[PDB]
Amino acid sequence: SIIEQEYLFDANEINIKYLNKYLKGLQHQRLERHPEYARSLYVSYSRTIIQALGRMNRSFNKMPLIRLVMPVNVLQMVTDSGIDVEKTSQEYRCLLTAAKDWERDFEKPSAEIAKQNATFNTFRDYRFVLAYL
Amino acid sequence: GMMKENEFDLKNAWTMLSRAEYQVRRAMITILADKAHVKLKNISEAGASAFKLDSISKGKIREFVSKQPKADSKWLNETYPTFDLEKKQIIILTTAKFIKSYTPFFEKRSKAFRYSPILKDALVVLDEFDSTKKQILESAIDEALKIQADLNSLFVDLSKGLNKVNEGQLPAKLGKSFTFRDAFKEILNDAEQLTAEFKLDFLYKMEEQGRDSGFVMRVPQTNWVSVGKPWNAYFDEELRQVVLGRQPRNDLNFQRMLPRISVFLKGATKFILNRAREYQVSENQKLSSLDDAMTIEDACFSIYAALGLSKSQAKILFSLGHDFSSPTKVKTTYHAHSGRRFQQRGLSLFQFTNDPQHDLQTKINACFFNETPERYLLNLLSKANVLGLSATATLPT
Amino acid sequence: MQVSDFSGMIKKLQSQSPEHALMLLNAPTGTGKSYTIIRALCRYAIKHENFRAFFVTDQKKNLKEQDFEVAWREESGAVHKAFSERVAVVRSLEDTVNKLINDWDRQQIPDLYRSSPIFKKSLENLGNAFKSFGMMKENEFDLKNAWTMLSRAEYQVRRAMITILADKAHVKLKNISEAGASAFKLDSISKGKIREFVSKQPKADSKWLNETYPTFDLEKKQIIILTTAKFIKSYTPFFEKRSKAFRYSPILKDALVVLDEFDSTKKQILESAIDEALKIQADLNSLFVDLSKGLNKVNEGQLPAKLGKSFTFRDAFKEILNDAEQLTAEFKLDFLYKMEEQGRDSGFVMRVPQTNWVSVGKPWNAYFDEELRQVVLGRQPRNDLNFQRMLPRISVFLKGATKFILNRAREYQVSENQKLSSLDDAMTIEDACFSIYAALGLSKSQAKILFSLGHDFSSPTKVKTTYHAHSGRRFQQRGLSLFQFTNDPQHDLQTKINACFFNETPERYLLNLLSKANVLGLSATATLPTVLDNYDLGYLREMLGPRLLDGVHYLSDTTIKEFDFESRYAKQKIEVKVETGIVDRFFSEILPKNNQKIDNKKIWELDAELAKLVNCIPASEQSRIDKKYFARRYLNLFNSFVIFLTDPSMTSFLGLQSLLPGADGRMDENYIKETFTTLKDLVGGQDGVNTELRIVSSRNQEGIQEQLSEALNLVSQGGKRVYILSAYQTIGIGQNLQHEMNEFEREQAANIAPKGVSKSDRRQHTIDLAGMYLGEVTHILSSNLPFRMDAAGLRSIIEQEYLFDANEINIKYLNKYLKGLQHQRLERHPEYARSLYVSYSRTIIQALGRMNRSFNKMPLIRLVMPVNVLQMVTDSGIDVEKTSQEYRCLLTAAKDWERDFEKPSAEIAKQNATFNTFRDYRFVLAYLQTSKSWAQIYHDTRWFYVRHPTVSDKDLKSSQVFQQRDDEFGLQYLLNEHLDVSYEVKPINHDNGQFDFSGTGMEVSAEAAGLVAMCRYPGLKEAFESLDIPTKWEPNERILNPAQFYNYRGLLGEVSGQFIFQNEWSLKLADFGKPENYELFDFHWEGKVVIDFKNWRDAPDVDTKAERQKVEAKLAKLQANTQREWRVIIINILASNQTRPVMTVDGKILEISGLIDHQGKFLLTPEQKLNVWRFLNG
DNA sequence: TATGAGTATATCC
DNA sequence: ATGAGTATATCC
DNA sequence: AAAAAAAAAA
DNA sequence: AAAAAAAAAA
């Protein structure tokens, strides 16, 4: 758990505020909700979905009509952010066109979180360097 | 198979199975040795536990199986690929097996793939890159939890060993390589200053009335206490102890003591790793037949044992960084830089334990996690080419 | 046997509360020892609330817990307590698991734990674990892992029960259950509430809980029944996971420990010690260095003052620190010892109280290489560090320092236990020792090995015990050690010296137990004088004194009279006949000599068959390719077969052997069975049909007692008398050998019942056996050829040490045995070791005791046995007038072949005493250089030698040097059997202390004394009379051995020589006041003269070269010592002829070879006086 | 160069 | 002291 | 103020 | 002559 949160922090997907809230929740056994705009969560969900949909693309003969059945949560969780959909299976592209009603914007919150994390890291570096100097 | 439910019994069941398999291997070894006229017992030991054969005897055995009928050799080579691991051009194995060790034929102790000479200049094809990372990560976590040691005693013993190195009380082979570097003098000075500053010569006694102590975490962003109130420590002169507890008095900066000793240990272990690499390179020159060369792990363990450290202390000190010492000023080619603090510092865990059999002090068991899968991959790339294949090899996550 | 007698013994033992005593009872088997001791234990437990007893036995079949239950029911008549909360049966983990799963299968769990699901799943996983554990009972290496899994499963079951009772008692299980989701610890009040809840619980469920888990409340169990294998080990308390050893637990304090088979316990203890010593091995150099660093940390005030104050103020602590610093400087222990690979196996080193020993022959040598900054160890001749000195010196330092730390740990524990309010969780001595060792920065393994060196044996500090414990048995006092050198690529820079110490013999364990609990030992053979199958009763008597009571001084005289049976048998006219089984090369005597043989060539066919069967063995090339002996054994067995066959009156027979018939040609069931079937109808007409044979063994697929019952029943109702073949081991003490009275028995029966017993007693309606065949009992001494550092090798060395202590073997035999082991060769068993024959007689007596457990008996009990057995039975040290009648007549027959022990035992005792004195004085010269107290001991004992050369026992024990040394260091006087004054000895080897007292070559008496050759000198005899040195040796019990006579002669000669030198040359020769000048020289003068005196006789077989090199080394030491350029004078006192001093070519050395002739008058020339005078001043 | 010649029991790690 | 819902692999 | 026993050589 | 990076406070 801790290492996953540290990975999210390193990739500029959660800021020090969310990490502090998560640690405080862990002190009380009151774990917080998953970060809403952490790109890695949705990309991992999409990765599992892509691997699953690749299991029906190992042949040249296909039935004229294909049916992909899933709950709404799968539609809400998949995304195309850094995923080259052009070189992905047609099934996943159709799934994305179906799930377009819930597409998120990750570039903005990632940008502000990157700024906040860079500032926090600089401040920690200077807090160390004074005490060592 | 029966004991596969509980993971505590898994270790013991695995050990028993390993012993049985080793006995089978020994039987096969005797059968092949008599067919090749090799004096096993003489090579091994007239007694029991031994079978330390020379290169020539096992070479004769390999020659005999090479000239053996095809079915026999095929079965032997399929069942025991490690019978002649140098001849194998392609080695197919799981990620979990790749991380861990392989047991050589003719031997009882297993050798890790990580430090084996079999990887030098090899090509590693990870067919499930990126699915491997989680596996590696999981293994890393498990290993981190297996290796724990009392931080105070570990630091004191390492400082004592380094001071022995300073006074020329170790063989000249490594002593003359330790002493001529200014980093050695600086390490000794830091050890002395830290011992004086945190009163580490004395016993840390943490009085509990029975309440759970939780643990303390150190992550690159902050410290963390699982039970709220920070731990404080002062030097009780009348008791000649270091009182550790929840009292407001903090004359020693315990929350500063915990990471400072860890940083010192990490740096000192890196220095010792460099010296052990030099020692291994020098020693492998003496060897004529480069078939029983010593690995970097063996050199590090030998250095730690010569310094007077225990086997567990050697394991925990060596795991603070596994043979990762970088290239050579990249020969002024490319500057490897990164702002990711967790990849560079990892994290640490500390738990305080009181036992009636060490009633006079409190043990500060430490647990360091430094080798993330990315660092493992970089370290692997320090000695082998890697080819990663999947349909999702470059998904940003 | 009256119960009141055992009650009297119990109350006498309890009367000895502060200084606990040991009581041994000798009562023949078949009498009510176990029964009446159980009754008396139950009665005393009921009457007295605080009485606690441990009924410790050796085999699980002898617990007699049902007998305890019956006795408890009978003795209790008012409260009739439930017997489960007062009497406990502590069983093994495996037995507890077996009981648990049997209760699960048979619904024996009182439906309070069965209903809960967690308890269920614990039971299924525990059953699975037990199935796997039983599946893996073949190998012992993996037995540890299976035991660990079983222990974990059982602990899970216990935790389930704990939480069930917690929720049923409203106790804050949460405190634990949250803060302890693994460790699961509780506090005293919660477990007290649980205990008081289960106290008021219904009878059935609390009864089951107390029966299956005696450790639920151990401080309430008055009687604890267990096996000695469990008694030595630990018990796992309820509400806890870490097991606690019985040895250090407070439950033994002031308890009474009843050992139901006293002599059989020692063996069980000995191996339990041996394999323990091998489990605890540590690197010697690292161990010493770490202990030294910890002690130095204590000195610098870095340990908490709580123990720093206890450590620092003692002088012994400063002495320890100085000794450790000197040892580190001397042996270069700060540096790494590296041994280059030997190619071949390096073997191991062993040290025993008599010598060092190397399994490879070539000695190990070590020197400091300065260029390498290392210590090189190997077979090279260069030995500058004295490795053979290094190992014992470090081991001795470790032993002493650990004893000091153990004393400090006792103080720490007694101080810490006072602060605690609850006495149910105080720390034991082991916890204190481990805490102190961990405080000095020592690893858990290092702490374990350091603690295992003396454990918690301390002895009473008070000097008013009114009895001085003393013993000259070196093995009991210093044990033995083993060292193995190992190299490994993981520690490539250094060679590990793994050390293994054996210091706790079973006698020392018993003495340690007697320091905190009374011991009552019961056995039919509790006091047999053997040191191999019984405790060293001599050592125990020496170390106990009045604390070693005898149980017979409390039995009713009626029972003592009843013990004898030789009058009972004559009243009923019972005859016991025994004859020798004479056998030679071929079967010419197993056939009946009576001229009624039908087939002649069939005998040749049988001979050819046995020759073929003994020639089909490829074991060894000696002993006629291992064929000659086996044939003789077979023919003796078949002679027994024939003798049983011819007689129709023999209702049953038990031909006990030392082998189980197996596959190999040694003993095979098929050949014996076919031979018996042939001889059945080969001799006699009714003999073949009436006689039968049936073999009972563990090689079959069924138990032993039940098949014996089957055979006895076949005799009882099948009408056919049977021959039963067994081994001495497969049927031991505690096994029954009686059957119902068949008609043939009914019409030929008799009774020897005592007075006061009805006709329906258990022993009244059973009958005894008709005669046994006694084959050669073997293996008393181990004979494992591949002598390695394992349990068998330690057992062999320990048996030899035991023999050497009890004065049964001498130094030459031990040296020969060790050299044989060095060459993988065994030596002949000692021919006059009393312990061998007493153990042989012991196993025969134990076998014969199984036919005397019943009243009804049949007459004409004929005995048959091999001739070799008749050669090895003895009555020495055995109460022949109180043992079984069968053994009595066996000794009567043996009277022709009995051998003497007194003379060889006395000779070996003299040799061993002299050897021990020589070794003691050899150690004194090594250590005298450092300290000065040991100088005081040496001076005091050396003067005690001449104060009164012939001493009585009472005078010697009540002395000043014998009283404080706690052993017989240098005071091993001989025993004058004829109260004589003089004796002659032949010295085999002077520099090894080997003497033969049946030889000639050196007489010791007043010839070397004042009254001759020196008394007549004026001013010399008067000084001796003033110095209380009598010139006449009074005829009393003890006299000085040759090693002590050497010091006696040397002291007299040195005093006389100093006096005459001072008289002749008129100066006061000052004494060496320098502590460094020990062993340097006798006396000094004017800063450049050193004077040495000797009392040697006329010219011995010694060359001048030895004296020259001795004085050369001595003067090198002297110049290195006093920083001058000394010149030496040496003196020989007596000379029959004119022998003038001989000077060196340069005049460096002065050597006078005679001053006073054998009359006491001066002989030296006045010109030579002038020569010595002007040489003395230069 | 040189001998003596088993089976069995029980418990923790 | 709620958010969120696992199977695969292998040495000590 | 209760720590012990250490030589060589075969 | 290739050791690291160490605030409090929550």
Ligand SMILES: Nc1ncnc2c1ncn2[C@@H]1O[C@H](COP(=O)(O)OP(=O)(O)O)[C@@H](O)[C@H]1O
């Ligand atoms: N006083 C007695 N009352 C009842 N039985 C006795 C008595 N004395 C001996 N026996 C019986 O003789 C046998 C052996 O005696 P026991 O009391 O067990 O002591 P041991 O085992 O030392 O001979 C047992 O079967 C026992 O029942």
